[PDB]
Protein backbone atom coordinates (compact mmCIF):
# COMPACT_ATOMS: atom_id res chain seq x y z
CA UNK A 1 0.00 0.00 0.00
CA UNK A 2 1.42 3.35 -1.12
CA UNK A 3 2.43 5.71 1.68
CA UNK A 4 4.64 8.76 2.09
CA UNK A 5 7.94 7.73 3.71
CA UNK A 6 10.23 10.66 4.53
CA UNK A 7 12.47 9.09 7.20
CA UNK A 8 13.46 5.52 7.93
CA UNK A 9 10.92 3.74 10.06
CA UNK A 10 10.92 3.56 13.84
CA UNK A 11 11.28 0.52 16.09
CA UNK A 12 8.74 -0.56 18.71
CA UNK A 13 9.88 -2.32 21.87
CA UNK A 14 9.07 -6.01 22.07
CA UNK A 15 7.72 -8.45 24.63
CA UNK A 16 8.61 -14.86 28.20
CA UNK A 17 7.49 -17.62 25.89
CA UNK A 18 6.09 -16.04 22.75
CA UNK A 19 4.85 -18.53 20.16
CA UNK A 20 5.24 -17.46 16.49
CA UNK A 21 4.23 -19.42 13.39
CA UNK A 22 5.63 -20.48 10.01
CA UNK A 23 7.00 -18.37 7.14
CA UNK A 24 6.10 -17.84 3.47
CA UNK A 25 9.23 -17.52 1.31
CA UNK A 26 8.58 -19.90 -1.61
CA UNK A 27 5.67 -17.65 -2.66
CA UNK A 28 8.05 -14.85 -3.62
CA UNK A 29 7.19 -12.70 -0.60
CA UNK A 30 10.11 -11.09 1.18
CA UNK A 31 9.79 -11.90 4.87
CA UNK A 32 7.95 -9.15 6.75
CA UNK A 33 9.01 -10.52 10.15
CA UNK A 34 9.65 -7.19 11.83
CA UNK A 35 12.45 -6.89 14.43
CA UNK A 36 9.65 -5.99 16.84
CA UNK A 37 8.35 -9.51 16.22
CA UNK A 38 11.49 -11.63 16.22
CA UNK A 39 14.20 -10.32 18.52
CA UNK A 40 14.41 -8.14 21.62
CA UNK A 41 14.19 -4.49 20.59
CA UNK A 42 13.97 -1.08 22.16
CA UNK A 43 12.10 2.00 20.95
CA UNK A 44 14.29 3.81 18.41
CA UNK A 45 12.80 6.97 16.92
CA UNK A 46 14.66 6.74 13.62
CA UNK A 47 15.26 10.20 12.15
CA UNK A 48 17.50 8.98 9.34
CA UNK A 49 16.29 10.67 6.18
CA UNK A 50 15.80 8.45 3.16
CA UNK A 51 15.95 11.40 0.77
CA UNK A 52 19.34 10.62 -0.71
CA UNK A 53 18.13 7.17 -1.74
CA UNK A 54 15.31 8.64 -3.83
CA UNK A 55 15.51 7.87 -7.54
CA UNK A 56 15.63 11.58 -8.26
CA UNK A 57 18.57 11.88 -5.85
CA UNK A 58 20.11 8.64 -7.12
CA UNK A 59 20.49 9.63 -10.76
CA UNK A 60 20.46 13.45 -10.98
CA UNK A 61 24.20 13.91 -10.95
CA UNK A 62 25.81 15.72 -13.87
CA UNK A 63 27.88 12.79 -15.04
CA UNK A 64 30.37 13.15 -17.87
CA UNK A 65 28.78 11.49 -20.89
CA UNK A 66 30.93 12.72 -23.79
CA UNK A 67 34.50 13.97 -24.01
CA UNK A 68 36.28 14.64 -27.30
CA UNK A 69 39.17 16.83 -28.32
CA UNK A 70 38.86 17.98 -31.92
CA UNK A 71 41.68 19.80 -33.68
CA UNK A 72 40.93 23.14 -35.30
CA UNK A 73 42.74 24.67 -38.27
CA UNK A 74 35.12 14.39 -37.55
CA UNK A 75 37.60 17.14 -38.30
CA UNK A 76 37.00 20.66 -36.90
CA UNK A 77 33.79 19.66 -35.06
CA UNK A 78 32.27 16.68 -33.35
CA UNK A 79 28.83 15.16 -33.17
CA UNK A 80 27.63 12.78 -30.51
CA UNK A 81 24.52 10.62 -30.55
CA UNK A 82 23.11 11.16 -27.09
CA UNK A 83 23.24 7.84 -25.27
CA UNK A 84 23.77 6.75 -21.70
CA UNK A 85 25.80 3.77 -22.94
CA UNK A 86 29.04 5.76 -23.13
CA UNK A 87 30.63 5.67 -19.68
CA UNK A 88 29.93 2.46 -17.77
CA UNK A 89 29.79 4.09 -14.36
CA UNK A 90 26.56 5.86 -15.32
CA UNK A 91 25.45 2.97 -17.54
CA UNK A 92 25.33 0.44 -14.70
CA UNK A 93 23.47 2.99 -12.59
CA UNK A 94 20.80 3.42 -15.29
CA UNK A 95 20.70 -0.28 -16.17
CA UNK A 96 19.35 -0.84 -12.68
CA UNK A 97 15.96 0.16 -14.08
CA UNK A 98 14.00 -1.02 -17.07
CA UNK A 99 11.97 2.07 -17.94
CA UNK A 100 13.31 5.56 -17.31
CA UNK A 101 11.63 8.91 -17.91
CA UNK A 102 14.16 11.70 -17.56
CA UNK A 103 14.73 15.19 -18.87
CA UNK A 104 18.40 15.55 -19.68
CA UNK A 105 20.19 18.73 -18.65
CA UNK A 106 23.16 18.98 -20.98
CA UNK A 107 26.06 21.16 -19.82
CA UNK A 108 28.72 21.62 -22.49
CA UNK A 109 32.08 22.43 -20.89
CA UNK A 110 34.68 23.64 -23.38
CA UNK A 111 38.39 23.82 -22.57
CA UNK A 112 41.31 24.74 -24.84
CA UNK A 113 44.86 23.43 -24.64
CA UNK A 114 47.86 24.48 -26.73
CA UNK A 115 47.79 33.95 -25.44
CA UNK A 116 44.69 31.78 -25.35
CA UNK A 117 41.96 32.55 -27.91
CA UNK A 118 38.41 33.48 -26.93
CA UNK A 119 36.55 31.36 -29.44
CA UNK A 120 32.80 31.13 -29.94
CA UNK A 121 31.18 27.70 -30.07
CA UNK A 122 27.81 26.42 -31.28
CA UNK A 123 26.27 23.37 -29.63
CA UNK A 124 23.48 22.54 -32.03
CA UNK A 125 21.15 19.80 -30.85
CA UNK A 126 19.97 17.80 -33.88
CA UNK A 127 17.03 15.54 -32.98
CA UNK A 128 16.53 12.31 -34.86
CA UNK A 129 15.04 13.03 -38.26
CA UNK A 130 16.76 16.36 -38.72
CA UNK A 131 19.99 16.19 -40.65
CA UNK A 132 23.33 16.21 -38.93
CA UNK A 133 26.27 18.29 -40.18
CA UNK A 134 29.19 16.82 -42.04
CA UNK A 135 31.57 19.79 -42.08
CA UNK A 136 32.31 22.69 -39.78
CA UNK A 137 30.74 25.06 -42.33
CA UNK A 138 27.75 23.09 -43.56
CA UNK A 139 24.38 24.71 -44.11
CA UNK A 140 22.85 22.61 -41.34
CA UNK A 141 24.50 24.71 -38.65
CA UNK A 142 22.47 27.73 -39.75
CA UNK A 143 19.19 25.81 -39.39
CA UNK A 144 16.42 27.80 -37.81
CA UNK A 145 14.54 24.87 -36.35
CA UNK A 146 17.41 23.12 -34.57
CA UNK A 147 18.12 24.29 -31.03
CA UNK A 148 21.55 25.83 -31.38
CA UNK A 149 23.20 27.40 -28.35
CA UNK A 150 26.00 29.91 -28.93
CA UNK A 151 28.50 30.09 -26.12
CA UNK A 152 32.03 31.39 -25.88
CA UNK A 153 34.81 29.78 -23.89
CA UNK A 154 35.58 32.50 -21.33
CA UNK A 155 32.10 32.30 -19.78
CA UNK A 156 30.08 29.86 -17.66
CA UNK A 157 29.45 26.56 -19.48
CA UNK A 158 26.44 26.41 -21.75
CA UNK A 159 23.58 24.53 -20.16
CA UNK A 160 20.35 23.48 -21.88
CA UNK A 161 17.58 21.13 -20.79
CA UNK A 162 16.69 18.50 -23.36
CA UNK A 163 13.17 17.24 -22.62
CA UNK A 164 11.80 13.72 -22.60
CA UNK A 165 11.57 13.12 -26.34
CA UNK A 166 10.88 9.40 -26.50
CA UNK A 167 7.79 8.67 -28.53
CA UNK A 168 6.81 6.14 -25.86
CA UNK A 169 6.04 7.09 -22.29
CA UNK A 170 9.44 5.94 -20.98
CA UNK A 171 12.89 5.09 -22.23
CA UNK A 172 13.29 1.37 -22.72
CA UNK A 173 16.77 1.03 -21.26
CA UNK A 174 16.52 -2.67 -22.07
CA UNK A 175 14.59 -3.46 -25.24
CA UNK A 176 13.94 -7.19 -25.55
CA UNK A 177 13.15 -6.86 -29.20
CA UNK A 178 14.28 -5.76 -32.61
CA UNK A 179 14.28 -2.41 -34.36
CA UNK A 180 12.01 -1.77 -37.29
CA UNK A 181 10.25 -4.61 -39.08
CA UNK A 182 13.01 -6.15 -41.21
CA UNK A 183 14.67 -9.23 -39.75
CA UNK A 184 18.20 -7.83 -40.17
CA UNK A 185 17.35 -5.25 -37.49
CA UNK A 186 19.64 -4.81 -34.53
CA UNK A 187 18.79 -6.38 -31.20
CA UNK A 188 18.23 -4.26 -28.14
CA UNK A 189 17.90 -0.98 -30.01
CA UNK A 190 14.58 0.79 -29.65
CA UNK A 191 14.00 3.43 -32.35
CA UNK A 192 11.96 5.38 -29.80
CA UNK A 193 14.85 5.42 -27.30
CA UNK A 194 17.00 7.71 -29.47
CA UNK A 195 17.54 11.15 -27.98
CA UNK A 196 19.17 12.90 -30.91
CA UNK A 197 22.57 14.35 -31.78
CA UNK A 198 24.56 17.02 -29.97
CA UNK A 199 26.73 18.62 -32.63
CA UNK A 200 29.33 21.14 -31.43
CA UNK A 201 31.50 23.25 -33.72
CA UNK A 202 33.64 26.37 -33.49
CA UNK A 203 31.72 29.24 -35.07
CA UNK A 204 34.94 31.08 -36.02
CA UNK A 205 36.57 30.78 -39.41
CA UNK A 206 39.96 29.19 -40.05
CA UNK A 207 42.52 30.73 -37.69
CA UNK A 208 46.23 29.86 -37.95
CA UNK A 209 46.38 28.74 -34.31
CA UNK A 210 47.78 25.57 -32.76
CA UNK A 211 45.10 25.00 -30.11
CA UNK A 212 43.16 21.81 -29.39
CA UNK A 213 39.58 22.19 -28.16
CA UNK A 214 38.52 19.59 -25.59
CA UNK A 215 34.75 19.49 -25.15
CA UNK A 216 33.03 17.81 -22.20
CA UNK A 217 29.28 17.19 -22.14
CA UNK A 218 27.59 16.76 -18.76
CA UNK A 219 24.15 15.16 -18.81
CA UNK A 220 22.15 15.49 -15.62
CA UNK A 221 18.93 13.46 -15.93
CA UNK A 222 16.16 15.15 -13.99
CA UNK A 223 12.44 14.82 -13.31
CA UNK A 224 13.14 11.12 -13.15
CA UNK A 225 10.43 8.51 -12.96
CA UNK A 226 11.91 5.03 -13.03
CA UNK A 227 10.19 1.68 -13.33
CA UNK A 228 10.91 -2.05 -12.90
CA UNK A 229 14.27 -2.39 -11.16
CA UNK A 230 16.73 -5.01 -12.30
CA UNK A 231 19.72 -6.95 -11.03
CA UNK A 232 22.81 -4.76 -11.05
CA UNK A 233 25.17 -5.80 -13.79
CA UNK A 234 28.13 -7.62 -12.28
CA UNK A 235 30.15 -8.73 -15.27
CA UNK A 236 32.19 -6.23 -17.29
CA UNK A 237 30.59 -4.82 -20.40
CA UNK A 238 31.75 -5.81 -23.85
CA UNK A 239 30.09 -3.20 -26.08
CA UNK A 240 27.84 -0.17 -25.87
CA UNK A 241 25.39 -1.69 -28.35
CA UNK A 242 24.28 -4.71 -26.31
CA UNK A 243 24.46 -6.57 -23.01
CA UNK A 244 27.16 -9.08 -23.90
CA UNK A 245 29.32 -10.49 -21.14
CA UNK A 246 32.71 -12.10 -20.78
CA UNK A 247 33.78 -11.59 -17.18
CA UNK A 248 37.23 -11.28 -15.71
CA UNK A 249 39.52 -14.31 -15.99
CA UNK A 250 39.25 -14.84 -12.22
CA UNK A 251 37.05 -13.69 -9.36
CA UNK A 252 35.74 -11.05 -8.62
CA UNK A 253 33.24 -10.30 -11.41
CA UNK A 254 34.12 -13.42 -13.37
CA UNK A 255 31.64 -15.57 -15.24
CA UNK A 256 32.09 -18.64 -13.05
CA UNK A 257 32.59 -16.54 -9.89
CA UNK A 258 31.21 -13.05 -9.32
CA UNK A 259 32.23 -12.89 -5.66
CA UNK A 260 35.91 -13.07 -4.74
CA UNK A 261 36.61 -16.50 -3.31
CA UNK A 262 37.89 -17.53 0.09
CA UNK A 263 39.43 -20.77 1.35
CA UNK A 264 36.31 -22.57 2.57
CA UNK A 265 32.78 -21.88 3.71
CA UNK A 266 33.90 -22.50 7.31
CA UNK A 267 36.60 -19.79 7.10
CA UNK B 1 18.30 48.86 -12.70
CA UNK B 2 18.86 46.36 -9.90
CA UNK B 3 22.24 46.80 -8.19
CA UNK B 4 23.85 43.36 -8.08
CA UNK B 5 27.29 42.17 -7.04
CA UNK B 6 28.85 38.82 -7.88
CA UNK B 7 29.40 36.42 -5.01
CA UNK B 8 32.26 33.95 -4.98
CA UNK B 9 31.24 30.84 -6.79
CA UNK B 10 29.75 32.75 -9.71
CA UNK B 11 30.15 31.03 -13.03
CA UNK B 12 31.20 27.78 -11.42
CA UNK B 13 29.78 24.53 -12.72
CA UNK B 14 29.05 22.47 -9.65
CA UNK B 15 28.09 19.06 -10.96
CA UNK B 16 25.60 18.51 -8.12
CA UNK B 17 23.73 21.80 -8.40
CA UNK B 18 19.98 22.06 -8.73
CA UNK B 19 19.01 24.95 -11.00
CA UNK B 20 16.48 25.47 -13.73
CA UNK B 21 18.11 25.63 -17.14
CA UNK B 22 17.14 26.87 -20.56
CA UNK B 23 14.75 24.53 -22.39
CA UNK B 24 16.07 23.70 -25.83
CA UNK B 25 12.64 22.89 -27.27
CA UNK B 26 10.08 25.58 -26.45
CA UNK B 27 6.44 24.56 -25.99
CA UNK B 28 7.45 20.94 -26.43
CA UNK B 29 4.71 18.59 -25.33
CA UNK B 30 6.31 15.40 -23.97
CA UNK B 31 4.78 12.00 -24.39
CA UNK B 32 2.06 11.61 -21.73
CA UNK B 33 2.78 9.62 -18.60
CA UNK B 34 1.36 6.15 -19.10
CA UNK B 35 1.05 4.05 -15.94
CA UNK B 36 3.87 1.52 -16.25
CA UNK B 37 3.80 -1.13 -13.50
CA UNK B 38 6.34 -1.27 -10.73
CA UNK B 39 7.52 2.29 -10.25
CA UNK B 40 10.55 2.76 -8.04
CA UNK B 41 10.23 6.10 -6.31
CA UNK B 42 12.97 5.33 -3.78
CA UNK B 43 15.91 2.94 -3.97
CA UNK B 44 15.16 1.54 -0.54
CA UNK B 45 12.32 -0.34 -2.22
CA UNK B 46 14.97 -2.19 -4.22
CA UNK B 47 17.01 -2.93 -1.11
CA UNK B 48 14.13 -4.39 0.94
CA UNK B 49 13.69 -7.25 -1.55
CA UNK B 50 15.28 -10.56 -0.63
Amino acid sequence: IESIIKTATDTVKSELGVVPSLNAVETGATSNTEPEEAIQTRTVINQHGVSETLVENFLSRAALVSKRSFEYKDKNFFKWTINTRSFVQLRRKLELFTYLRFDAEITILTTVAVGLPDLTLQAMFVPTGALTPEKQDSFHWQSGSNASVFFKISDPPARITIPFMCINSAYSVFYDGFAGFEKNGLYGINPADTIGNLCVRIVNEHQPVGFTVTVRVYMKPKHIKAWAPRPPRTLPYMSIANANYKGKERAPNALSAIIGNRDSVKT
Amino acid sequence: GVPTYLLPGSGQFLTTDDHSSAPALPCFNPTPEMHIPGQVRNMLEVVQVE
Binding site: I4, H223 | S20, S21, L25, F28
Partner: peptide, 28 residues
Protein backbone atom coordinates in the same frame (compact mmCIF):
# COMPACT_ATOMS: atom_id res chain seq x y z
CA UNK C 1 12.00 28.48 -12.87
CA UNK C 2 11.64 31.69 -14.84
CA UNK C 3 11.26 29.71 -18.06
CA UNK C 4 7.92 28.99 -19.65
CA UNK C 5 8.39 25.22 -19.94
CA UNK C 6 7.66 22.98 -16.98
CA UNK C 7 10.36 20.49 -17.90
CA UNK C 8 12.96 23.24 -17.65
CA UNK C 9 12.61 23.54 -13.88
CA UNK C 10 15.08 22.36 -11.27
CA UNK C 11 14.90 18.74 -10.22
CA UNK C 12 11.83 18.16 -8.04
CA UNK C 13 13.51 16.14 -5.28
CA UNK C 14 10.34 15.84 -3.21
CA UNK C 15 8.68 12.53 -4.14
CA UNK C 16 8.84 10.78 -0.78
CA UNK C 17 6.07 8.34 -1.65
CA UNK C 18 6.93 4.67 -1.50
CA UNK C 19 5.20 1.40 -2.20
CA UNK C 20 7.63 -1.38 -1.28
CA UNK C 21 4.80 -3.94 -1.19
CA UNK C 22 4.77 -4.19 -4.95
CA UNK C 23 8.25 -5.70 -4.76
CA UNK C 24 8.56 -7.35 -1.35
CA UNK C 25 4.91 -8.51 -1.35
CA UNK C 26 3.81 -8.90 -5.02
CA UNK C 27 1.22 -11.45 -3.95
CA UNK C 28 -2.51 -11.91 -3.65
Amino acid sequence: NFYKDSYAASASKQDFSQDPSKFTEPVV
